[PDB]
Structures are given as structure tokens and as C-alpha cells.
Amino acid sequence: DSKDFLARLSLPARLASEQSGVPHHLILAQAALESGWGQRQILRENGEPSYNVFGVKATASWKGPVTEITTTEYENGEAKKVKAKFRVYSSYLEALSDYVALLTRNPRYAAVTTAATAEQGAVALQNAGYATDPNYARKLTSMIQQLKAMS
Ligand code: NA
């Protein structure tokens, strides 16, 4: 949505940035990229938001509410219905806090939480194997530049 995406996520991203040390525009850029500027929603079975902008799956460790999404595979001429549980967050703040908490709790991402710029962080992330793109930093860095042009 035409820069409303920032109006929605900018404050929670900043607060998570300040909690974790992860650069503000990095978080925002990852969200903007992995949700298509927020156009990809993961809604609960009743249409309500999950606020789960990174599409994080729900595990046994997750104690919160969840939503199940049904997709389909046409394999061996059979139509297999597969279900996937996603975390439901209270707010975009909980969503982004859940994300950076993970980052904080794993030394493989030390370089992100002490990065001086967003672009440095995007580089530290690529190293650590995030997204398993070896040219990940570049995808993200263009998005970051686009976020900064807006701020
Ligand atoms: Na944290």
C-alpha cells in the first residue's frame, strides 16, 4: 500500500530496533520485502489479522494463538490438502519483537545486532545464511534504499 505500510510498521520496527540493536530500516526492509509492502496477509479463519508479517510458523514451543492455512498440492494426479499453522500476534509490535528476540538469542547473528548501518546488517545476515540466498544482501539493500527515500 502506497507508503501506508511504513505508517503501520515504522513505530514497532523502531522499538524493536532499539531493543535489539538491529538497524531500523533493515527490519522494515525485510518486512516490506517478505510481505510485498504488507500486501501478503495471513488471516485467521474469521478474516482477522494475524499481524504475522514474516509469516512465522507456529511450533510446539509457541504458546500463543494460531491460525491454520490450507493449500493444495496436485501430485501423482491426487489432490493433497496440506495445512500449516501460523503464529497469531497481538500486534505488529509483538510480531517484530518476536523476530528480533530470536536474532538476539543466537550468536550467528551477532554481526546484525551490532551493525552500524542497515546495509551492513543486510551483509551480516547474508553471511549467517539468512534466506539462503548468497546474493541476499543485494536484494535487501535495494529495498532499504527505497525505504530511506521515503522515511
Ligand atoms: Na531482543
Author numbering: 151 to 301
Task: Quote the study's own text.
The domain was found to adopt a lysozyme-like fold common to other GH73 enzymes, which consists of an α-helical subdomain packed against a β-lobe that forms an extended β-hairpin motif. The α-helical domain and β-hairpin of StFlgJGH(151–316) together form a groove-shaped active site, with the α-helical subdomain containing an α-central helix that houses a conserved glutamate general acid/base (E184), and the β-hairpin, in turn, containing a second glutamate residue (E223) previously determined to be required for GH activity.
Next, we determined the crystal structure of the truncated GH domain (StFlgJGH(151–301)) to 2.2 Å resolution to study the active site of StFlgJ in the absence of the C-terminal α-helix. The asymmetric unit contained three copies of the truncated domain. Though the C-terminal α-helix no longer occupied the active site, the catalytic β-hairpin of each domain was found to partly occlude the active site of neighbouring domains in the crystal structure. While this crystal packing did not provide an unobstructed active site, it did impart significant structural order to the β-hairpin. A superposition of StFlgJ with the structures of other GH73 enzymes reveals substantial differences in the position of the β-hairpin harboring the putative catalytic E223 residue. Removing the C-terminal α-helix, however, allowed us to determine a 2.1 Å crystal structure of the domain in which the extended β-hairpin, known to accommodate a second putative catalytic carboxyl group, was well ordered and revealed that the active site of StFlgJ seems capable of opening widely, possibly aiding in substrate capture and turnover.
